[PDB]
Design a protein around this ligand. Structure first.
Ligand SMILES: [Mg+2]
Ligand SMILES: [Mg+2]
Ligand SMILES: [Mg+2]
Ligand SMILES: [Mg+2]
Lengths: 97, 110, 41, 252, 87, 85, 291, 95, 107
RNA sequence: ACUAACCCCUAUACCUUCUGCAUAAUGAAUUAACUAGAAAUAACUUUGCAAGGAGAGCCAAAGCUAAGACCCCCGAAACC
């Protein structure tokens, strides 16, 4: 019980597909391009997560302040509740003071 | 950074002097920083540990270590405590000796 | 990334094998067997 | 014929000597030894800093990563707003909701809270220094070759593979040229159908690609481009404003 | 393979759609046009005359400086009066 | 997911489609304008900048209107801008 | 000589460096601690039951009920008006001599705030209530250079040292609005705005800049010669006659009090893209920029 | 103490310590004496004299005040004619 | 424990050493991978020591098979039929030599 | 341990709470799965540069930048 009685199907990985064979290209565009472009501008992803990093609390304010007006009603309510809980936990709880 | 202008007399009023040309014939060599200064700095840790560091060293760093403690033993009274880092080409001495080492490294042609 | 233990069967077998010659349910139930194997050791 | 000779245009420190590299050509199978090129000692002959390589490669892989994994908490699982049974008198364990982490189908106590970013930037001089170390490692391991230009007699991809096999270059070769708009037609059609052989411009050169590919080849304009770009780092002021703004001597 | 073309900054000034709601307001004011002209010169199409303030905004610009920034003589006279008062 | 437009843009968006999009231009412009009313229940500062007595510094000041509630009966009268506070 | 050669040659015999043989430098990665196992699992380093174990400890600075130490200390005006106090980054004669000797500052041309920041001699933060630089008297004995320097503040000894070598030192005021422009002209020119005239010094600073002994830029020039003689007599150095110097024209070059740069009248527009200067011609514009 | 603000997500500063304490750039903290303006008629001149100086805090209090104050107040300031300018650095300090 | 593990009396094989000593190790089989970090210790062991070990023990037959594998192994057979299998997964050279020498002395 | 399962000799279940539990103090019939340490102010370690560091802002009387590494789960009666 709790373990499979047969071997899982073997997995095949293409180490030389288009994405793997050219990962990291243009990451030094700023150094080698007279600083006309920043490697941060190559970041592809969420609007509030482009060239920025922070803890869970900080990510919630940044999402709310930038795209909060466009979120769904249920999602906005949950995001507001998450900020309230995170604010209480970080500013009032912990081993260290 | 602009290259320093040539003065008819040396050392300059601020105390700067260009490295001697040709460079000294030694197994080790120390190159000036990008501001044309001897790479000697003071380091402090824990608020009471004082160290002197020498950067931008390539060649036989052990020869430099041998020369450093020979030069510092009469001043300090015993063999100084030193750390040798080969991968980064730096030499660390316990205590503050920046002004003597800069003077010592200056007259050696570095 | 969700991680789950996959070798728990071997983790309990290394204890149950030392209790194979015992008497009662404490030779096959891990919760009982671990308490008596420690005493035996 | 007449050999091709390349000198170091940037001034060299007095205590250092240039490192020589052979110059080949791709127009023939046996067309090596076209000439000699002098490389800057401070770029192709610097210290073998493996730790610098490891941290630069780790920076490249993990700075553009964004994780989209996210799990609902007990406040986001549907329902569970009512106390199941009274606290005392029922004879069973006390609970306040059916969506608690202990309950089956409940929330997750400490789970992923995506999307999350791992973006961080190494110091500018360190990233440039990583390229110098990798080039020096390539030269020392004799897997780096210097060419004059990337024109091929035929655009046949099998011809390129046979040429690489004859010269014992390696399983995978990373090709680097000056500018994307200056690609010869033969090299583009030859490498487009090849997997282990990749063609990228000079601006696209990176440590991760160099480590992934056993063999690296550069053109003479590429070498001068790399020498100029890298040697600008170690003799420069601290930036008053971003370099994209006009300067007295930037761009050179 | 062959790499995709390098990502370059798009040449020429950007002029967004003034009638589109999604365009931010900071890209529509004369300040945005002034920045475009400085970066791209006469090729941006911005009239150089519009850079200097029109007479409509100059009248309060001098009114503000007159009311808030006193002249040298006024400051010196005020200082001399205070010096006499403390003496 | 995320909406293409912000929620507060929705009212403007429907005005550009349907029967509302066929309204006369002059009426649409008049309704679109959102000019501030004349102060009634609060006294305007009257100046863009003022000197703080505490530190003797010049700081910018603003006039924030006070919310006013208009009962439905006032629509049949002429209150002159006054309303319930 | 041999260290680099030995390290590189030793690399040749080693296998090819790839992505499968990289490791961080020792001591640079402290392993992460997790609350698992016997050593760190029973109580996870929280102690016995209580506020600390349950993570409900009071706020920082709370001593369990007695009057807080920081509260019971009486208030005093230590940092009142700190955001309105004026700050000046100190500049030493040794630093100036160090810059001149290394060539980062050109003494054959007038030296001001723009030149100092261009040579990276000083760092100015106008957002941090900075108002310029002050010339301090440190290392006045070893200073020997003929320069024309413009600094917001100066000491009586720093002025004497500059004038001893035949140099000229003057004090001028820069408002916070134009101070950022002076330190970083390039970002300002990209703003696409005409060059504004700098404001007059405040009422409290007017006496400082109208006094000859401070070498103020608004003081009477006729009061300068007697002031220089007093400094020369006090410190016992013969005052040189710089009128006979071949750099007399360069020494006398001073900017208008309403001017920002040299040769750039207020109200002009700089176009770096096409390397052009645009000047207004409206009579209202000209009167505003010149008065 | 607010470790993460709700509008910017950064540590705040307790303004109570700002109005009562002065910090030197060397790390020392300068404070007044409690009750130095209270009931002066019932205190001897020697007691009143020692009540009106500026005294330093110990290691624990200095750590307490640093944690309640953001890095803005720990910077080096260059105020003109600052009375406490000479006290911002320590001289001849061993260990 | 002893109560949970079978026991035996102390004994030898055919009174070995009474008239002469006969080496009890009879066969050794080594599995080595040409490529793979797990076989590096096994690889260098046979480059410098397997030759000297073979000369030291002439009555023991050693087989070295080079095939792809994730865990290098050594198999020892004795004249009594006992078979011992030891993994060489990621060990050094001075410790495989001690490990190999230990199997030689065992009965 | 033994030739030998038992017979011989030795040995007061686990966790938690308390100064102290074989304790007749709580918890557990058993099995499978699920279920609980979140943050970088300072300090430490390791690179890079260095009177400068940093890809505008910030800090600096050897500092500056970067990285590593410390802060749990369930449960009320209630209030609107
Ligand atoms: Mg240090
Ligand atoms: Mg309820
Ligand atoms: Mg509840
Ligand atoms: Mg423990």
């Amino acid at each position: 019980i709790g373990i499979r009685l047969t071997l899982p199907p073997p997995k095949v990985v293409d180490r030389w597909n288009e994405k793997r064979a050219m990962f990291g290209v243009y990451d030094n565009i700023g150094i080698l391009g007279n600083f006309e472009k920043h490697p941060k501008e190559l970041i592809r992803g969420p609007i509030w997560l482009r060239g920025w990093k922070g803890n869970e609390l900080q990510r919630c304010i940044r999402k709310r302040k930038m795209v909060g007006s466009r979120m769904f009603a249920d999602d906005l309510h949950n995001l507001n509740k998450r900020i309230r809980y995170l604010y209480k936990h970080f500013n009032r709880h912990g081993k260290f003071r | 950074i602009p290259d320093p202008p040539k003065h008819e007399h040396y050392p300059t009023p601020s105390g700067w002097q260009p490295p001697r040309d040709p460079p000294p014939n030694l197994p080790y060599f120390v190159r000036r920083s990008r501001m044309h200064n001897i790479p000697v700095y003071k380091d402090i840790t824990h608020g009471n540990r004082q160290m002197t560091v020498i950067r931008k060293v390539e060649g036989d760093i052990w020869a430099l270590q041998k020369d450093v403690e020979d030069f510092l033993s009469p001043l300090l009274g015993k063999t100084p405590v030193t750390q040798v880092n080969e991968v980064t080409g730096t030499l660390r001495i316990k205590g503050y000796f920046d002004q003597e080492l800069k003077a010592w490294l200056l007259e050696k042609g570095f | 990334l969700r991680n789950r233990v996959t070798d728990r069967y071997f983790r309990i077998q290394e204890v149950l094998k030392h209790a194979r010659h015992f008497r009662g349910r404490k030779n096959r139930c891990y919760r009982l067997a671990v308490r008596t194997v420690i005493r035996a050791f | 014929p007449e050999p091709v000779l390349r000198k170091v245009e940037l001034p060299v420190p007095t205590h250092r000597r240039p490192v020589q590299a052979w110059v080949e050509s791709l127009r023939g199978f046996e067309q090596e030894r076209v000439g000699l090129a002098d490389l800057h000692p401070d770029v192709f002959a610097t210290a073998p800093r493996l730790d610098i390589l490891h941290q630069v490669a780790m920076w490249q892989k993990n700075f553009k990563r964004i994780s989209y994994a996210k799990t609902k908490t007990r406040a986001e699982v549907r329902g569970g707003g009512r106390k199941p049974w009274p606290q005392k008198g029922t004879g069973r364990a006390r609970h306040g909701s059916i969506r608690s982490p202990l309950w089956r189908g409940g929330g997750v106590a400490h789970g992923p809270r995506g999307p999350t970013s791992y973006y961080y930037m190494l110091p500018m001089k360190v990233r440039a220094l990583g390229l110098k170390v990798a080039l020096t490692v390539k030269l020392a391991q004799d897997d780096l070759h210097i060419m004059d230009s990337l024109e091929l007699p035929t655009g046949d991809p099998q011809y390129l593979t046979e040429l690489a096999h004859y010269r014992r270059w390696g399983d995978s070769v990373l090709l680097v040229d000056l500018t994307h708009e200056e690609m010869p037609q033969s090299i583009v059609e030859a490498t487009s159908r090849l997997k282990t052989f990749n063609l990228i411009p000079a601006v696209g050169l990176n440590v991760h690609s160099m480590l992934k590919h056993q063999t690296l080849v550069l053109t003479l304009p590429t070498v001068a481009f790399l020498e100029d770009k890298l040697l600008w780092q170690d003799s420069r002021y601290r930036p008053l404003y971003p370099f994209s703004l006009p300067y007295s001597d930037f761009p050179r | 393979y062959r790499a995709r073309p390098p990502p370059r900054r798009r040449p020429g000034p950007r002029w967004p759609d003034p009638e589109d709601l999604l365009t931010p307001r900071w890209q529509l004011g004369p300040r945005y046009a002034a920045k475009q002209f400085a970066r791209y010169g006469a090729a941006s199409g911005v009239v150089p005359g519009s850079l200097w303030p029109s007479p409509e905004q100059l009248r309060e610009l001098e009114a503000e400086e007159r009311e808030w920034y006193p002249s040298l003589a006024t400051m010196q006279e005020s200082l001399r009066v205070k010096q006499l008062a403390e003496e | 997911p995320l909406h293409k437009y912000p929620v507060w843009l929705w009212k403007r968006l429907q005005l550009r489609e349907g029967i509302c999009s066929r309204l006369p231009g002059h009426y649409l412009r008049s309704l679109e304008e959102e000019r501030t009313p004349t102060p009634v229940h609060y006294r305007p500062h009257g100046a863009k900048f003022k000197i703080n007595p505490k530190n003797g510094q010049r700081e910018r000041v603003e006039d924030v209107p006070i919310p006013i509630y208009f009962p439905p009966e006032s629509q049949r009268g002429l209150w002159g801008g006054e309303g319930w506070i | 000589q041999g260290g680099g050669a030995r390290a590189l040659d030793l690399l040749r015999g080693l296998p090819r460096v790839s992505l499968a043989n990289l490791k961080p430098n020792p001591g640079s990665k402290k392993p992460e601690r997790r609350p698992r196992g016997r050593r760190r699992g029973r109580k996870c380093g929280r102690g016995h039951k209580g506020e600390r174990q349950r993570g409900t400890r009071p706020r920082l600075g709370f001593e369990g009920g007695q009057t807080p130490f920081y509260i019971r200390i009486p208030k005093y005006g230590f940092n009142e008006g700190h955001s309105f106090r004026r700050q000046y980054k100190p500049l030493s004669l040794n630093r100036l001599q160090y810059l001149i000797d290394l060539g980062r500052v050109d003494p054959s041309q007038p030296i001001d705030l723009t030149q100092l920041v261009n040579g990276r001699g000083v760092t100015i933060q106008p957002l941090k209530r900075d108002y310029g630089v002050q010339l301090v008297e440190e290392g006045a004995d070893t200073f020997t250079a003929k320069v024309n320097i413009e600094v917001q503040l100066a000491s009586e000894l720093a002025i004497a040292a500059i004038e001893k070598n035949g140099g000229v030192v003057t004090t001028a005021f820069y408002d916070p609005r134009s101070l950022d422009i002076v330190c970083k002209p390039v970002p300002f020119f990209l703003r696409g705005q005409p060059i504004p005239k700098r404001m007059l010094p405040p009422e409290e600073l007017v006496p400082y800049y109208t006094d000859a002994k401070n070498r103020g830029y608004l003081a009477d020039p006729a009061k300068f010669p007697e002031a220089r003689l007093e400094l020369a007599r006090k410190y016992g150095y013969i005052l040189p006659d710089i009128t006979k110097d071949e750099l007399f024209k360069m020494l006398c070059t001073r900017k208008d009090p309403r001017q920002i740069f040299f040769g750039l009248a207020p109200g002009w527009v700089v176009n770096m893209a096409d390397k052009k200067i645009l000047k207004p011609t409206d009579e209202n514009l000209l009167k505003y920029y010149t008065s | 103490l607010t470790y993460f603000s709700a509008r910017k997500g950064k540590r705040k500063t307790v303004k109570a310590v700002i109005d009562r304490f002065l910090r030197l750039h060397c790390g020392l903290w300068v404070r007044r004496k409690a009750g130095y303006k209270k009931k002066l008629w019932k205190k001897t001149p020697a007691r009143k004299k020692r009540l009106r100086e500026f005294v330093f805090c110990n290691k624990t209090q200095s750590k307490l005040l640093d944690k309640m104050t953001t890095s803005f107040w720990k910077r080096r300031n260059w105020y003109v004619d600052d009375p406490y300018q000479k006290y911002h650095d320590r001289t001849n300090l061993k260990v | 424990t002893a109560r949970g593990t079978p026991s035996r009396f102390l004994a030898s094989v055919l009174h070995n050493g009474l008239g002469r000593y006969v080496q009890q190790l009879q066969r050794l089989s080594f599995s080595v991978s040409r490529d793979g970090a797990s076989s590096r210790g096994a690889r260098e062991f046979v480059e410098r020591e397997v030759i000297d070990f073979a000369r030291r023990n002439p009555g023991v037959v050693i087989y070295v098979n080079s095939r792809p594998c994730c865990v290098p192994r050594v198999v020892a057979e004795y004249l009594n039929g006992a078979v011992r299998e030891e993994s060489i997964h990621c060990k050094s050279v001075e410790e495989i030599s001690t490990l190999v020498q230990k199997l030689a002395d065992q009965s």
